[PDB]
Design a protein around this ligand. Structure first.
Ligand SMILES: NC(=O)c1ccc[n+]([C@@H]2O[C@H](COP(=O)([O-])OP(=O)(O)OC[C@H]3O[C@@H](n4cnc5c(N)ncnc54)[C@H](OP(=O)(O)O)[C@@H]3O)[C@@H](O)[C@H]2O)c1
Ligand SMILES: O=C(O)COc1cc(Cl)ccc1C(=O)NCc1cccc([N+](=O)[O-])c1
Length: 315
């Protein structure tokens, strides 16, 4: 199937286009190309500073009648400086206006860590620690629920929540809507088995981010492993007559995950979508899982003393 059923009763395309790092001068064409070659899910965020340009492409393909709005699944995320109850609707509405949408299919709490509101996305103290917000994830969640009840978003969810944090929301007193999605880092070097089964056992769909290991991440170092260049993965790809990226994308698909590879390269946007006509064997799957090294693209030293920092816990 190309879509997975969420606990809100809506269907979500299991392949989407990521947009973090997509330059504002190239992401309009990248999203236009993606829609033209079949993509119906775009992963966005205010903090990525390119929603206006992504929105230009969405609007143009709607206008061109390449796609209908109902056929699209647009996702964005509440940035950390907007966890306060009074700031959530505005933050959502700014994203909607930029994306030139009247609703989002899914809106996520981007990180469990709330930061001091202001112009700065990472407000810092003199020693470089991030300045927290005294807002907690359950009050932020109640504000997310209000967005559903106002018709601005069809589904709400979370991202980078560890299993204790997911658990806290599922056990929130008065919980009105369960999280539909937990969007987390996942690839053969960070296979996430425990957190994934926990979420799936609760009816929470997991989206895998950085599925290719985010080779363009701005903090990359030489010592770092490289999925795309791992000869063991290259060999599985060769066997299947596919590219390494195609294998890295099909892998989470077969674990019942949604996956959101990013590219601004038209040829790779198309390649990355051509993953619905081959199957990895159980053995291939277990082999790729065996490459786990608990290696994370996404974690910040500036946040490690925040009370809600998600990655001290095992999972
Ligand atoms: N929730 C959050 O905290 C969070 C965090 C990180 C990421 N995400 C989302 O997840 C998306 C995907 O993660 P990501 O951007 O970190 O990295 P990614 O998708 O793992 O990797 C993107 C890198 O791979 C390259 N690439 C793409 N397709 C390729 C192919 N077929 N062959 C060779 N190289 C290829 C891209 O190059 P070109 O673009 O130059 O083609 C780019 O440098 C993000 O864009 C964002 O939407 C969410
Ligand atoms: O977060 C993403 O979607 C991708 O990563 C980005 C993207 C942009 Cl535009 C800016 C900054 C980041 C980034 O440093 N994310 C890591 C991060 C953030 C917050 C808290 C944490 N944390 O660990 O508590 C980690």
């Amino acid at each position: 199937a190309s879509r997975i059923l969420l606990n809100n009763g809506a269907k979500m395309p299991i392949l989407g286009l990521g947009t973090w790092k997509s330059p504002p001068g190239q992401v309009t064409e990248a999203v236009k190309v993606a829609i033209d070659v079949g993509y119906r899910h775009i992963d966005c965020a205010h903090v990525y500073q390119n929603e206006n340009e992504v929105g230009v492409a969405i609007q143009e393909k709607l206008r061109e009648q390449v796609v209908k709005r109902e056929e699209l699944f647009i996702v964005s995320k509440l940035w950390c400086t907007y966890h306060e109850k009074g700031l959530v609707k505005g933050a959502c509405q700014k994203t909607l206006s930029d994306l030139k949408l009247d609703y989002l299919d899914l809106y996520l709490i981007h990180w469990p860590t709330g930061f001091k509101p202001g112009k700065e996305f990472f407000p810092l103290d003199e020693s470089g620690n991030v300045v927290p917000s005294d807002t907690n994830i359950l009050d932020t969640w109640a504000a997310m629920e209000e967005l559903v009840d106002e018709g601005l978003v069809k589904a709400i969810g979370i991202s980078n929540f560890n299993h204790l944090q997911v658990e806290m929301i599922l056990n929130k007193p008065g919980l009105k809507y369960k999280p539909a999605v937990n969007q987390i880092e996942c690839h053969p070097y960070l296979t996430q088995e425990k957190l994934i089964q926990y979420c799936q056992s609760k009816g929470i769909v997991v989206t895998a981010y950085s599925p290719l290991g985010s080779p363009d991440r701005p903090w990359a170092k030489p010592e770092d492993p490289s999925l795309l260049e791992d000869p063991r993965i290259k060999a599985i790809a060769a066997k299947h007559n596919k590219t390494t990226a195609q294998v890295l994308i099909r892998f989470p698909m077969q674990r019942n995950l949604v996956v959101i590879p990013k590219s601004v390269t038209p040829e790779r946007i198309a390649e990355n979508f051509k993953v619905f006509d081959f199957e990895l064997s159980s053995q291939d799957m277990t082999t790729l899982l065996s490459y786990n090294r608990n290696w994370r693209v996404c974690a910040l030293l500036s946040c490690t003393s925040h009370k809600d920092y998600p990655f001290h816990e095992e999972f």
